[PDB]
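=== Structure Prediction Worksheet ===
Name of assembly: unnamed complex
Input type: mixed (protein and possibly other molecules)
Chain count: two
Listed entries:
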Amino acid sequence: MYLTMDLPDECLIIVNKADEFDRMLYHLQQECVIYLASEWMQSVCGDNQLCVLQIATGHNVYLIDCLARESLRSEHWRLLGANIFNNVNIRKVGFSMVSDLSVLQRSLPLQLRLQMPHHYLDLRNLWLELKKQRFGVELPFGNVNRAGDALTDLSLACLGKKLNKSNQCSNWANRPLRREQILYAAIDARCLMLIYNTLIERVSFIQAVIEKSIASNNFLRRGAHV
Amino acid sequence: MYLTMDLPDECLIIVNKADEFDRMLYHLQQECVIYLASEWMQSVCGDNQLCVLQIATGHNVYLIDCLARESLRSEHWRLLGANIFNNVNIRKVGFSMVSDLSVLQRSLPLQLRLQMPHHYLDLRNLWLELKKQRFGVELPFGNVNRAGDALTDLSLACLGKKLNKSNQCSNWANRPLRREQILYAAIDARCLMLIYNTLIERVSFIQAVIEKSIASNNFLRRGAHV
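=== Predicted Assembly ===
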């Protein structure tokens, strides 16, 4: 079966007004790990359209409306960048993070500081580091050496459920979002928390692997697109 | 084990001069199916750098140097767009084609005609269409309903080998390319041919599925990034 949202509806927090954004900044600043996902629209000739930014904590998910630009002003985005993204004491966990950060940086005035990005953890890079083990790594639902590299493969091996890709190809610009869209976007962030916490609890040498992975981060130098 | 290049070295044709490009146009114009892949570099704040465009036929692979812009002039790219990409009598087979075509269109003056793109076949979309079957589809090395959606998953199910991701994260702008880079780029295109031909030969109702897939193509309207 597919991964479902385990949080109560009250813990999925839609942010499309300034007072909601200010409250979110207050809570995010007190966390030491958050989990990043986004939803955006693309075409062959058009500019990318960033629609949703998801920031999960260990206990809730913020769904920020990136099209709400008359209520969410430049200074809001700048402070999200300065206080949270650029804060070396908050670990930002994501998956395939060059793509996510590129769309964010080009769409929003976050002014990300990308030198020495050791406060970002890309689970895709961490997964590849685990696969460098000679005998693999045994997880609750399989060995990393038998798993693929997509986010749904991490979810299967760690949590035992695939990600439901229904509503993946919806119109992320529709307002209000359908319930199925809110759940899909929230799962995209919450599953990173569940995967990360599975590795933290179940892989005895995980801290050495994390340090190697965060050391390999490079967002400023060109790398091959994957 | 991993998929290896089966073609002789002479059938991997590097194109970085005008006379080579003109000869390629002559041969491509006589094909009715070609297979498209590309290699490019990205960073969070920099512009995407298109490095290699791979165009495979059934019997060889062209590796076009997209950085050779003093020898490969605008009219060369325009004629590749007009004579081959925009030619409704040549099927262009690819995988995750919005991303590929977006980088091509923004980097090169191909002037792609994207209305009614029924002469493109995206194997990723075709794969998802096959997964809509109630009982799955049995392929030589597994059922589509047990496979993932990455290109390496199509390769495993159809051909029995994963794609080697060593040299995936190389510097695609280095000249000359290392031998390992030429082979990786050539496999990225050649494997589409091997997968397509496996489906053509082994799935009895494949033509109805192809028609549904090509009908769903839309490159002009915004769609969710996957």
